[PDB]
Amino acid sequence: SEVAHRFKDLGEENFKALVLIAFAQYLQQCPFEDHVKLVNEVTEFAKTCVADESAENCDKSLHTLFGDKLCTVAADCCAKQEPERNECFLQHKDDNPNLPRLVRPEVDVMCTAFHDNEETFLKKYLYEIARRHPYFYAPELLFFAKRYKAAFTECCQAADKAACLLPKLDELRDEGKASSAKQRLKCASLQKFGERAFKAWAVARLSQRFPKAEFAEVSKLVTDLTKVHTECCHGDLLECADDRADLAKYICENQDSISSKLKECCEKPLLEKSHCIAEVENDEMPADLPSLAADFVESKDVCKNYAEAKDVFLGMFLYEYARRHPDYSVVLLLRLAKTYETTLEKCCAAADPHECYAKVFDEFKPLVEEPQNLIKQNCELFEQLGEYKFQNALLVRYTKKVPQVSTPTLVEVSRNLGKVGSKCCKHPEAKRMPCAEDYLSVVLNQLCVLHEKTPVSDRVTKCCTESLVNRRPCFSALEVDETYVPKEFNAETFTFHADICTLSEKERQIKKQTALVELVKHKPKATKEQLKAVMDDFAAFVEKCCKADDKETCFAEEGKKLVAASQAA
């Protein structure tokens, strides 16, 4: 029995949470009560299996069971069987579910609901997250759950809870979203590019982190880590959580052989141990490391070793170049690795290989400089305009690049792209690249998955599927879509009402930002000069109407003077 197996390993508390998340991610539209019902029904069945490991259908696989329990409340997916059925659900996960924005009741209400029924209060948090983020890293979701519990348990018995809770919750909302984003990239990598692309990313990344660890060790870690994510991304949550635990035990046992900063980590609860390890800082670089040129360019055995085991050899190249370059981003190392392999494949087929592949490092120079100059420039620019105007500049830049993309998506992606400046520019040159480029990877992956749902721009598709590691350079290289045909104005689209006054300070910018996007789609060829001169106007239209006697009509009157002057520029 598989269910009995995983139940014992995870316990009832985790087993129940993990199954709840699985159901929330598969059927994101179904209400909370229903999932809760199926979880219990499933959980009890599991208890009978622990005893009689041959009772009802304790012999069946998790998917069969989970599948049959969801099919009692869903249709074409359920008409299929075993493999096809499961794949069906996976293909129907929705990265942008049409769910109602989540609003939080007054502190007083939450603390009452928390104190009264704690298990329920926590199970609904899990449910509301898992249904909105169908790819959230299950094991980590359990970690956020506990921290959420600690938030309430502590703040609800204080002087001013509003002051104690609200903050801790915002920090959690953001970090939860970041977390969801990073995991969305790993699944896309696996699902759209293959495990080989995933493995290479891990080798380079872990080699940067555990520079003292041996290649064979990293390889071992990478292999386990791959299976872990392969499972979480495919919906095998229980085994994912299980396997993740094992990997944490291993890493801790073999500390000495991996990294010296794993101490603090291995001295704490499971959930906190895993989370700790996954976010540990890079270890100190081994003192005397030979030159790479020795074994990879000067040696006359290159092509022979390459021929013998192309995978192991290139894998070793990555590990070696990565370990001594924690100042490079993972994508830059992968571009280098790809440039090195391309040189061997051609050179090793020449008369005198050595001569041909002797200047491969000269090929690396341009690739390393591109990222640096880009970052340098844009951080300087960021420092000058600040985060709000920088987001605006990005909205104009990206709407011009790919005008077809839906206004909600452009607004969302550009805002996030703007956050890269705040999160990264503050670091010194040494840590900027990893920061900047790996964050751009996550955000542009967001644009790619939201766009894959309803493809409208061939330019987006090409930049998203041609190469995982070159997405950033591809998007960067786009200027303006010259074939794009301007859109015709729509009254409703540019009609500002008084309801924009009740909206938070941020909810306003977002509106003014959404207007900017529509404007650029209308006048692609317009200039950053005109645009700014027009935006300022919109600002004026809000301040007056929002504060001018009983006027829900100023929205139409003053909005008229708005569109009028708007149609002019």
Residues contributing to the annotated binding site: 2, 9, 63, 227, 231, 234, 236, 239, 242, 246
Per-residue tokens: 22: 């699985």
d(CA 442, CA 398): 16
- CA distances to 63, 64, 387, 492 from 67, rounded to whole Å, are 5, 5, 46, 45
Would residue 214 be called left, alpha or beta, if left means φ above 0 and alpha means ψ between -120 and 50 degrees? beta
d(CA 402, CA 406): 10
**Coil, strand or helix at 188:** helix
- The answer to whether the Cα torsion of 311, 316, 321, 326 is positive or negative is positive
Would residue 207 be called left, alpha or beta, if left means φ above 0 and alpha means ψ between -120 and 50 degrees? alpha
- CA distances to 131, 385, 426, 546 from 539, rounded to whole Å, are 37, 18, 30, 11
**Coil, strand or helix at 10:** helix
Binding residues for Ca(2+): 2, 9, 231, 236, 239, 242, 246
Contact in structure between 232 and 137 (CB atoms under 8 Å):
yes
**Coil, strand or helix at 282:** coil
Contact in structure between 567 and 544 (CB atoms under 8 Å):
no
- CA distances to 46, 233, 324 from 59, rounded to whole Å, are 11, 24, 50
Binding residues for (4Z,15Z)-bilirubin IXalpha: 227
Contact in structure between 475 and 410 (CB atoms under 8 Å):
no
Binding residues for Zn(2+): 63, 234, 236
Q: Which residues contact 236 (CB under 8 A, 6 or more apart)?
A: 62
Q: In terms of residues, how long is the chain?
A: 569
CB atoms within 10 A of CB 533: 11
Residue recorded with tokens 């926590």: 122
d(CA 395, CA 400): 8
d(CA 537, CA 568): 13
Contact in structure between 88 and 75 (CB atoms under 8 Å):
no
- The answer to whether the Cα torsion of 551, 555, 558, 560 is positive or negative is negative
User: Residue 218: which H helix or E strand, with range?
Assistant: helix 215-234
**Coil, strand or helix at 119:** helix
Contact in structure between 395 and 517 (CB atoms under 8 Å):
yes
